[PDB]
Design a protein around this nucleic acid. Structure first.
Lengths: 127, 296, 228, 226, 170
RNA sequence: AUGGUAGGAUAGUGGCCUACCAUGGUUUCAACGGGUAACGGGGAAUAAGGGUUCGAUUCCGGAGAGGGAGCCUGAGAAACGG
């Protein structure tokens, strides 16, 4: 269940679960706003705020708990070679417990007061 | 031209689907490859291994021999069937006679050299043809003729130029990153029948190209998991890299210093340097005190 | 010393660095180079100081005695020579331009709003690019809108929404102030909200959201942009 | 009735790594052989190192170079299959301000030969100086050069507009007077420059066929003479 | 002399300690200011020119809330019994954030009699806190970080907050 | 070393540190590793009104005040003004 540690967690919220509107054209899934997981580091119903940079990419690794690795890539144009060459740089982002995310699964990610030294972005929408 | 172009597209994907299915044989073979390297190496070490569990080892070695010879015959049979259907082997009459014959181990040995030699002649024809095909199509023949001859070698020629050096690439496949020690390896080197373990010739860990192959697996499996799902993208491939190196052979307590370290800390050798006999008694009456305690 | 100062390379080794003030330092401008270097109006900084002390010039309704007051976009400068009044404007060719304005258009100043926030004791406010804070604003204005300021008080006389169709001047970015100032708006990856501008010579080209400066309407805008 | 044309490189790619799992089965064969005289299994080791160079360096750089057109044939396979199913059912940028965008397109290639040729052609009076007013030191310095005139009216307009002088400091005067006068001793003679013909800057970049944006189609010249 | 600097760490690859700077004033990783119970002691620390952090070295009372009616009085401390992130912190009896500490909430009882007028079985609250008004040793957490606040704040545990924490007590 | 949560510390996100967990992360599209008076690069900067492509303008790679170690005040700082 949700209670799996030595301390109870609940966000202070600056309805028992305060909905927060993201802006930038986004809306919660109904599983997130009527969930039971607390997860104050999740970008919705939490103290962290989503703003600024956005990017979309493909999930490449989902092996471990509450963060995932996104492969985003482009056929990068080397000017001297006159060649579009594919280059991927897999960045790790946080995943909220509102989206059952597997590999593949085109998603959108954005900066969330970056969490632990490489987690710079956070999922906001699946497709 | 629309139907002729994309009928080949069915041929590409069915060759690519058949490409992924043979790596599933390559996935499921590794536990045999790992456990073969821990087998005894010499003739004498096999006999001492047969003494401990003599009746149990004899049925399994016969079961291993039956399962290997069954698997060896059908894999030659599939290689004959593949080269006939992909017009690699020009002699259909010889190849169709090999399929119906019950073959021993040495006849499967010699047919391996037959299928590899026919593949070798097919390879130098294909690799010279397609390297000419891409070089004429790219338009770089009229722009790169006089400056970069050492890099613009044909793909067949680029293969055999690395086949000048069997020596260095055979130093690659003895690299024992897995730290695998065979049975009675310590006895055989001490007896002279065969230490930096990082190069071990009797140990056969071909993991180096296999990790490249498993890197070639994850590159091809990602490109082939487009529609629904492929055979094995990362399941039992990265895990197969892990369990042979004991997932990481590391301890979290030894990392933080939460476990005791049996290593020399190089500044703290000799400031508090030892003393003379600092026991003011002669230490044998304290042995009587330790034997017969004044609390016990 | 960049080129938007529009100053010759001669007569000066160390350019006057602007001091702290109500604008970003890159499009900032001290009044000393406004008088003695672009209006050709004084000759030395010592009489530029004497200009400020004797209070015959003023900026935005305040006397503002400082050599290095930074000057932003279309500030109101008041001088006492035949009761003339001045306003800056941006040029296409990468420079500054000040021109005469009469006193009725000098009474107002149309400025873009920076941020909006509910403040102390539950009241709302809004801030602009020039540091001027207006409280109890229009609730229907959003980010990157504009407001007229009174120049006697700090309140509102006029305001228009940001939209697609009306004159939205460009300021900052790789471009700097093309006349025509509108096509439309759309989004982009990474942010960097796409704003397109069509000139009188009918060419469309994309910019960012922070360069929004809604200057008026087709036909009559609220600014008195001169003739080239 | 005709079989579909298989790709020969993919057959080699499939065939060579079919040659692997056979060759690695040998490696299991010698480790299971109690009478194995070669505990290193060198023969298959050379067999296994053989076919990887085909896989790593033979097929894979070719397959990467063919990757767009191999994908091209597969997507048109996908497109009929949706169409016949439908028939059966029936990135970064800058926006960064720079400096070299509004400087004049004159100073790099102002060419004195064409400006003198149009001076003779376009019948414009040219504001020539007087007879004795040109010379500078009665002697050693030259009579007058046109570049020296162009700098002089520019600095005296700077005098007559911004109302201030400028000094003769030795940091600038080491170059701005000395090699200027040493050039003026040997280049401008009798009021006319002659050293510029002995110079070796090629004059075709500022000219060719009177401008740039010249030839891609036949229409660019067609509306030129029209 | 403790470091809070980011370049001391290894990279995502694990780059081998590039050694760019040494320590400056700006990344001044301060000492851990662990407190204890006792007579109240305050340290004023000047950081960033005009920010005055308040180091609480010893503290004896706190402002702990009771959420079911929303009230908080001043209660004399007794001693910590559990902390989630540490165990020897409890034996040290150093009060950090989220530490479960005992109090003798007599004015909470005195407010209860001054608002209701009924004794505690010697509109209502659940039965598991009636086990220890007779004991007079009520449990409370810590809400604020005492190391920079110079203050001790918390709340009384409420409903499931007991039922998960005496489970973690035993 | 990677994340989880909690705590300490910070002006502040933060594995920055600590506690207890889960074992992971970056790679053939090259991770890691060998060469550079990197007095060499930087539109850094007008130009050079023809000295072939620059004669000239500047940013530039750091540490330190006899040497390690710690402290101190100031919106400035681990000061060569203790």
């Amino acid at each position: 269940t949700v209670q799996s540690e030595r301390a109870f967690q609940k966000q202070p919220h600056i309805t028992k679960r305060w909905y927060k509107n993201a802006g930038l054209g986004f809306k919660t899934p109904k599983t997130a706003i009527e969930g039971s997981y607390i997860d104050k580091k999740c970008p919705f119903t939490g103290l962290v705020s989503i703003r600024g940079k956005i990017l979309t990419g493909t999930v490449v690794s989902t092996k471990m708990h509450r963060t995932i690795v996104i492969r985003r890539a482009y056929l990068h144009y080397i000017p001297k070679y006159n060649r579009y060459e594919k280059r991927h740089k897999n960045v790790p982002v946080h995943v909220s417990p509102a989206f059952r995310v597997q590999v593949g699964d085109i998603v959108t990610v954005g900066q969330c007061r970056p969490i632990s030294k490489t987690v710079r972005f956070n999922v906001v929408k699946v497709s | 031209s629309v139907q002729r172009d994309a009928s080949k597209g069915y041929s590409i994907l069915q060759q690519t689907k058949l490409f992924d299915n043979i790596i599933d044989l390559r996935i499921k073979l590794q536990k045999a490859v790992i456990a073969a390297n821990k087998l005894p190496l010499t003739t004498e070490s096999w006999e001492e291994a047969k003494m401990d569990d003599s009746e149990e080892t004899k049925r399994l070695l016969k079961e291993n021999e039956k399962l290997f010879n069954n698997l060896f015959n059908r894999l030659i049979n599939f290689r004959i069937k593949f080269q006939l259907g992909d017009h690699i082997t020009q002699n259909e009459e010889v190849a169709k006679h090999k399929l119906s014959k019950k073959r021993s181990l040495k006849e499967l040995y010699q047919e391996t050299n037959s299928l590899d030699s026919e593949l070798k002649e097919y390879r130098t024809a294909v690799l010279n043809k397609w390297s000419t095909k891409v070089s004429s199509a790219s338009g770089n023949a009229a722009l790169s003729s006089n400056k970069f001859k050492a890099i613009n070698l044909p793909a067949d020629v680029q293969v055999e130029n690395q086949l000048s050096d069997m020596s260095r690439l055979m130093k690659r496949t003895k690299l024992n990153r897995r730290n695998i020690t065979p049975l009675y390896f310590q006895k055989d080197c001490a007896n002279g029948r065969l230490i930096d373990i990082t190069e071990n010739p009797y140990v056969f860990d071909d993991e180096d190209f296999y990790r490249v192959l498993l890197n070639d697996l994850i590159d091809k499996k990602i490109s082939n998991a487009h529609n629904s799902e492929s055979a094995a993208i990362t399941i039992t491939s990265t895990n197969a890299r892990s369990n042979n190196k004991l997932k990481k052979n590391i301890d979290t307590k030894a990392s933080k210093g939460r476990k005791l370290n049996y290593s020399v800390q190089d500044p703290i050798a000799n400031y508090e340097a030892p003393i003379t006999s600092g026991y003011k008694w002669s230490d044998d009456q304290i042995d009587e005190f330790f034997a017969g305690l004044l609390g016990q | 010393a960049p080129h938007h100062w529009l100053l010759d390379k001669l007569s000066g080794c160390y350019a006057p660095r602007p001091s702290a003030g109500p604008h970003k330092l890159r499009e900032s401008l001290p009044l000393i180079v406004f008088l003695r270097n672009r209006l050709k109006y004084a000759l030395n900084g010592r009489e530029v100081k004497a200009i400020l002390m004797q209070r015959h010039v003023k900026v935005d309704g305040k006397v503002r005695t400082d050599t290095t007051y930074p000057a932003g976009f279309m500030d109101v400068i008041t001088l006492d020579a035949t009761n003339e009044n001045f306003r800056l404007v941006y040029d296409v060719k990468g420079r500054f331009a000040v021109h005469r304005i009469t006193d009725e258009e000098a009474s107002y100043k149309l400025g873009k709003v920076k941020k909006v926030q509910l403040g102390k004791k539950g009241v709302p406010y809004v801030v602009t690019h020039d540091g001027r804070t207006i409280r109890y604003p229009d609730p229907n204005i959003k980010v990157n809108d504009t407001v007229k300021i009174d120049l006697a008080s700090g309140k509102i006389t006029d305001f228009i929404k940001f939209d697609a169709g009306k004159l939205v001047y460009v300021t900052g970015g790789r471009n700097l102030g093309r006349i025509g100032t509108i096509v439309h708006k759309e989004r982009h990856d990474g942010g960097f909200d796409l704003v397109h501008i069509k000139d009188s010579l009918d060419n469309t080209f994309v910019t960012r959201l922070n360069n929004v400066f809604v200057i008026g309407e087709q036909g009559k805008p609220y600014i008195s942009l001169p003739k080239g | 009735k005709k079989p579909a044309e298989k790709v020969s490189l993919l057959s080699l790619k499939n065939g060579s790594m079919l040659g692997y799992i056979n060759s690695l089965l040998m490696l299991i064969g010698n480790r299971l052989d109690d009478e194995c005289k070669d505990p290193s299994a060198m023969d298959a080791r050379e067999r296994s190192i053989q076919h990887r160079v085909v896989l790593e360096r033979g097929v894979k750089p070719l397959e990467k170079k063919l990757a767009y057109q191999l994908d091209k044939l597969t997507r048109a396979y996908v497109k009929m299959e949706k169409e016949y199913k439908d028939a059966e059912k029936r990135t970064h940028f800058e926006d960064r301000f720079d400096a070299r965008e509004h400087k004049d397109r004159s100073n790099k290639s102002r060419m004195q030969a064409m400006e003198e040729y149009i001076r003779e052609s376009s019948d414009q009076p040219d504001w020539s100086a007087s007879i004795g007013a040109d010379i500078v030191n009665h002697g050693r310095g030259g009579i007058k050069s046109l570049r020296d005139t162009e700098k002089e009216r520019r600095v005296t307009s700077f005098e007559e507009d911004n109302f201030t002088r400028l000094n003769i400091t030795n940091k600038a005067e080491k170059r701005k007077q000395k090699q200027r006068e040493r050039n003026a001793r040997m280049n401008v003679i009798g009021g006319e420059d002659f050293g510029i013909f002995s110079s070796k800057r090629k004059l075709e970049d500022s000219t060719s066929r009177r401008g740039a944006k010249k030839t891609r189609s036949a229409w660019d010249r067609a509306q030129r003479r029209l | 002399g403790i470091s809070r600097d980011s370049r001391h760490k290894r990279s995502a690859t694990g780059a081998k300690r590039a050694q760019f700077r040494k320590k400056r004033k700006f990344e001044l990783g301060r000492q851990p200011a662990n407190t204890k119970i006792g007579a109240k002691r305050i340290h004023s620390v000047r950081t960033r020119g005009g920010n005055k952090k308040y180091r609480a070295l010893r503290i004896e009372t706190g402002n702990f809330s009771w959420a079911s009616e929303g009230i908080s009085k001043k209660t004399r401390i007794a001693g910590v019994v559990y902390h989630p992130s540490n165990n020897e912190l409890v034996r040290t009896n150093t009060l950090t954030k989220a530490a479960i500490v005992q109090i003798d909430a007599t004015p909470f009882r005195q407010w209860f009699e001054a608002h209701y007028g009924q004794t505690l079985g010697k509109a209502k609250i659940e039965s598991s806190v009636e086990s220890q008004f007779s004991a007079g040793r009520l449990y409370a957490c810590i809400s604020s970080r005492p190391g920079q606040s110079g203050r001790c704040d918390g709340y009384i545990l409420e409903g499931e907050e007991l039922a998960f924490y005496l489970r973690r007590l035993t």
